[PDB]
Amino acid sequence: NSKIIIDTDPGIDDSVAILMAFQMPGVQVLGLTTIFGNCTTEHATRNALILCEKASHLEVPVAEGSHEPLKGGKPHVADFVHGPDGLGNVDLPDPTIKKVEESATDFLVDKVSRFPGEVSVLALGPLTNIALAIKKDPSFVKNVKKIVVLGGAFFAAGNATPSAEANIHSDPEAADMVFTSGADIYVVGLNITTQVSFTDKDLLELRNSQGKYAQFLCDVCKFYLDWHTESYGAPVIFLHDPVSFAALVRPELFTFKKGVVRVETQGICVGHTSMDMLLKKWNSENPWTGYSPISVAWTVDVPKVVAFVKELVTKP
Amino acid sequence: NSKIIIDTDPGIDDSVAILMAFQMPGVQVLGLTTIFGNCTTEHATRNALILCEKASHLEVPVAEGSHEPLKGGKPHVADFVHGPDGLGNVDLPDPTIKKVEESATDFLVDKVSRFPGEVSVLALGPLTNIALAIKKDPSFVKNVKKIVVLGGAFFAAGNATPSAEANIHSDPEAADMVFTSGADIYVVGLNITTQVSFTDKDLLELRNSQGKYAQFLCDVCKFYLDWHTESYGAPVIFLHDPVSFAALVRPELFTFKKGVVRVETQGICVGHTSMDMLLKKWNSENPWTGYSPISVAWTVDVPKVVAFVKELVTKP
Numbered sequence: 001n002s003k004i005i006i007d008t009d010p011g012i013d014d015s016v017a018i019l020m021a022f023q024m025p026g027v028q029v030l031g032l033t034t035i036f037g038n039c040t041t042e043h044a045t046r047n048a049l050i051l052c053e054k055a056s057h058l059e060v061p062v063a064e065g066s067h068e069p070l071k072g073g074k075p076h077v078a079d080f081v082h083g084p085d086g087l088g089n090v091d092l093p094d095p096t097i098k099k100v101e102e103s104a105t106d107f108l109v110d111k112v113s114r115f116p117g118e119v120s121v122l123a124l125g126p127l128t129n130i131a132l133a134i135k136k137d138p139s140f141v142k143n144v145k146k147i148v149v150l151g152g153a154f155f156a157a158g159n160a161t162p163s164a165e166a167n168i169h170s171d172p173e174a175a176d177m178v179f180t181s182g183a184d185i186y187v188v189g190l191n192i193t194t195q196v197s198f199t200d201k202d203l204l205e206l207r208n209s210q211g212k213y214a215q216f217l218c219d220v221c222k223f224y225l226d227w228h229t230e231s232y233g234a235p236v237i238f239l240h241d242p243v244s245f246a247a248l249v250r251p252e253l254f255t256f257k258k259g260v261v262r263v264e265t266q267g268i269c270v271g272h273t274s275m276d277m278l279l280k281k282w283n284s285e286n287p288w289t290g291y292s293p294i295s296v297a298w299t300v301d302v303p304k305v306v307a308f309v310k311e312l313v314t315k316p
Numbered sequence: 317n318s319k320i321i322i323d324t325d326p327g328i329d330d331s332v333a334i335l336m337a338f339q340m341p342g343v344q345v346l347g348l349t350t351i352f353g354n355c356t357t358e359h360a361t362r363n364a365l366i367l368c369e370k371a372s373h374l375e376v377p378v379a380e381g382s383h384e385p386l387k388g389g390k391p392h393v394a395d396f397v398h399g400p401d402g403l404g405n406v407d408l409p410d411p412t413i414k415k416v417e418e419s420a421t422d423f424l425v426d427k428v429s430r431f432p433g434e435v436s437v438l439a440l441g442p443l444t445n446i447a448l449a450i451k452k453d454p455s456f457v458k459n460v461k462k463i464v465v466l467g468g469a470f471f472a473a474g475n476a477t478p479s480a481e482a483n484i485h486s487d488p489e490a491a492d493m494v495f496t497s498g499a500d501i502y503v504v505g506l507n508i509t510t511q512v513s514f515t516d517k518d519l520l521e522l523r524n525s526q527g528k529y530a531q532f533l534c535d536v537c538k539f540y541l542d543w544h545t546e547s548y549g550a551p552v553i554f555l556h557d558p559v560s561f562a563a564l565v566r567p568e569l570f571t572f573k574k575g576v577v578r579v580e581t582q583g584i585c586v587g588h589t590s591m592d593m594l595l596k597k598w599n600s601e602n603p604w605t606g607y608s609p610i611s612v613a614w615t616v617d618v619p620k621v622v623a624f625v626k627e628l629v630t631k632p
């Protein structure tokens with residue numbers, strides 16, 4: 001049983017990924033650590049607790065994280081994507097279970113130090129809690145097994161601006177800190193996830209299946225599909241967070257390229273992820289020379305990832 | 317007949333492109349406007365005059381442009397690529413012809429205003445002179461026939477930094493000004509030019525040909541080839557500027573995608589070209605929404621571009 005901590009802003013696709021993790025054999029969810037992005041951190045915390053309740057996992061701790069990015073200020077949330085409270089149009093009563101007292105930072109630090117070399121972190125939102133855990137404990141990057149990040153856009157369009165993917169754009173300083181931290185990092189960007197199309201047809205099939213959470217997953221994905229159809233002009237949704245979950249437990253369905261990743265933290269291209277490709281020898285030193293390289297998901301076996309997500313969500 | 321002005325930093329591949337333009341039927345070179353990049357502006361001016369002499373085009377004016385980018389300061393020149401002199405360490409006698417008195421800015425403004433809708437500008441270097449022409453005259457963007465730009469890297473690695481192509485990196489403010497100006501612009505980036513490989517075998521065939529400028533072009537390309545062999549680890553050169561010349565006179569050999577292009581002018585990603593693909597409706601305004609889209613070369617018929625360059629340089 002592989003120990004994982006999911007740092008998340010649920011969030012419609014995060015909810016799919018969280019329920020997939022609870023349904024995944026050989027995986028133990030130590031806890032959910034929450035962050036803003038798709039919704040406010042308080043809405044993310046409420047949705048994480050609703051998910052734990054829904055999955056009969058009342059014992060899985062939910063530790064609330066940062067309410068603001070590292071630079072401070074009230075975050076702009078993707079409510080036009082994930083609904084006013086982050087759960088699309090799904091009307092569910094408030095959870096009875098409560099968050100634990102410890103912050104996401106402290107929860108991350110404690111579990112990694114308690115089980116050194118055993119815990120994998122799946123980062124589904126902005127990287128604020130992860131950068132904060134790094135700031136707090138210098139042994140965190142050495143003791144964390146790996147960090148699988150859903151974020152960035154490597155030689156692909158961003159979704160927050162033409163240049164930036166949302167999770168990175170939501171906290172550029174945190175992302176740059178994490179990517180240069182020297183931890184064993186695997187980054188899954190929009191270059192990968194926009195290749196994995198899920199259709200209106202796939203959702204209707206799911207609605208008509210025996211999947212444990214099929215009804216809820218279709219109800220929650222409805223707002224998500226309506227927004228994608230409106231914004232992209234196609235009845236296709238991208239399940240970014242489930243795709244990164246596949247990179248975490250089925251990394252053989254992807255190929256990874258190693259290289260230094262830096263994040264633009266200022267200007268019009270704020271949130272942009274730039275990777276040094278190692279194909280050209282630099283005549284002069286630059287912001288990418290001297291850092292530890294990380295792994296960036298480069299290719300993806302799309303039918304196999306689709307089949308893997310479907311297997312987990314259709315499971316009775 | 318087609319009237320063109322070539323803005324250039326010759327430069328080894330610029331020299332190939334300039335001699336190709338002089339060898340191109342139905343093309344009239346109104347003049348060469350010089351800029352820094354591959355070498356200092358004074359070295360670029362000397363090389364442009366040497367090229368006009370070599371080509372028996374003593375009547376073609378050479379107008380010297382800016383010595384610094386728009387933001388000021390001394391530019392870093394690509395002498396490791398184009399030699400200390402900008403011609404691959406080939407010593408040539410000083411030209412007898414002299415530059416005209418007018419600056420590149422004034423030359424560009426005068427010819428465009430004198431022949432409205434007739435003049436095409438081929439931009440082979442940093443875009444400083446073109447930005448200065450737009451700043452001086454608001455009718456420039458309306459009266460220039462088109463601007464064909466060799467610059468940027470669209471969803472591809474840069475060659476100045478992992479994030480930026482050299483011409484843009486050399487003057488980011490000028491590039492951002494040109495790209496948002498509303499002129500009819502066509503941009504050919506590294507995403508295109510790195511697809512058009514020329515080898516040590518192609519250079520030996522050129523030396524075996526009766527090409528008018530074969531001796532000179534093989535002499536200057538030895539430095540260019542040695543640097544590519546050293547930096548890229550392959551006996552392959554990229555003739556970026558000749559490829560943009562092919563986009564100018566044979567645009568049917570490429571496909572173009574329309575989109576708004578902005579340039580990062582600060583931070584680690586300075587010089588980065590980010591294109592809004594226009595496939596996603598933005599929920600909020602951003603630095604890419606209030607501008608006229610430009611055309612970005614998307615695909616290229618590589619054998620046809622190679623054959624076109626070879627035909628022009630092997631021509632006795």
Ligand SMILES: O=c1[nH]cnc2c([C@@H]3N[C@H](CO)[C@@H](O)[C@H]3O)c[nH]c12
Pocket residue numbers: 011012013014037038078081124125150159160165166167240241
């Ligand atoms: O279009 C979008 N804009 C902003 N965020 C998202 C997301 C969320 N942000 C991440 C992908 O940008 C992912 O974790 C997902 O939960 C999906 N689509 C969009």
Ligand SMILES: O=c1[nH]cnc2c([C@@H]3N[C@H](CO)[C@@H](O)[C@H]3O)c[nH]c12
Pocket residue numbers: 327328329330354394397440441466475476481482483556557
């Ligand atoms: O590797 C390079 N670094 C910087 N500039 C160039 C160039 C010049 N700069 C442009 C392409 O980056 C093009 O106009 C060419 O003349 C070729 N190769 C390199």
Ligand SMILES: [Ca+2]
Pocket residue numbers: 008009010011013014037038124125241
């Ligand atoms: Ca998320």
Ligand SMILES: [Ca+2]
Pocket residue numbers: 324325326327329330353354440441557
């Ligand atoms: Ca050039």
